[PDB]
Amino acid sequence: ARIAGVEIPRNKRVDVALTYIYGIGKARAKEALEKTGINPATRVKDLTEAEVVRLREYVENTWKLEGELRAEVAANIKRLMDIGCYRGLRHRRGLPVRGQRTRTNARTRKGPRKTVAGKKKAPRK
Amino acid sequence: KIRIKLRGFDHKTLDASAQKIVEAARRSGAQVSGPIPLPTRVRRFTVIRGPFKHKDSREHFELRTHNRLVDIINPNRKTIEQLMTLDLPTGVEIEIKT
């Protein structure tokens, strides 16, 4: 059943399945199960309607998940850029932000490589 | 109950205490617990053999500190008089807390 915004994890432990929800991770999961007394090991397909409702009414009225969360984050970074912020300019360039060395290994933040002229008449190492 | 600690960078110089202090009364006055060795804290200084590069060279230097306990119950009048100020070692330090 749908716990969080359009969420349908089934055939798995509740505390694991819950993770598939956006803003929900291992912590929030095993936490929402304790504050609603739902045996974490139980499979979603084996949950009481009564239990699901509790989970639904809780997890949604306790945290800010899914799309609405993407919205805030998408919004936050956009804010960093609108103002002349530094981290902002970094987000514009697509370069690391948490002060990482960009002479090498900035791949994850730069996507596939953009190999161009790297040498011509000197040690090509 | 005489407790005297013995530090030092040389282990033969410290011995210039046991074979000198236990000569008062080992089987007459006090019992003299004798000089206990105790572990010896070692300090290593590892250094690159030469200036500039050559990280894989290095030479090792240690500054071994030796210890001694002694401890002698029965702070005898005459026994202390002798074992009072008749020493010789220069590379030894003493601590007293009997």
């Binding site: 804010r79 609108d82 103002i83 002349g84 912020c85 530094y86 981290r87 300019l89 360039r93 | -």
Partner: protein, 80 residues
């Protein structure tokens, strides 16, 4: 995920120089070298000319940039 504890820091060079302009009016350019100072509410409106190691760049302070440091709005290195 920033952090400074409990005791927001700002260099009194301007901290005491700004609170003054709040006793008269605005002011054009306030060249400083203190990019350490966490911009405080009582600055919005003022135009602090932060230094970049080479020049003083004017940064109009807005409600939006409260807890941000003056340096963050004054880029240092020059890329393409």
């Amino acid at each position: 995920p920033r952090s400074l504890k409990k005791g927001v820091f700002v260099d009194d060079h301007l901290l005491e120089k700004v609170l003054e302009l709040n006793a008269k009016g605005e002011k054009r350019l306030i060249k400083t070298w203190s990019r350490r100072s966490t911009i405080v509410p009582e600055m919005v409106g003022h135009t602090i000319a932060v230094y970049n190691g080479k020049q003083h760049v004017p940064v109009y302070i807005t409600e939006n940039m409260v807890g941000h440091k003056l340096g963050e709005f004054a880029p240092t290195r020059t890329y393409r």
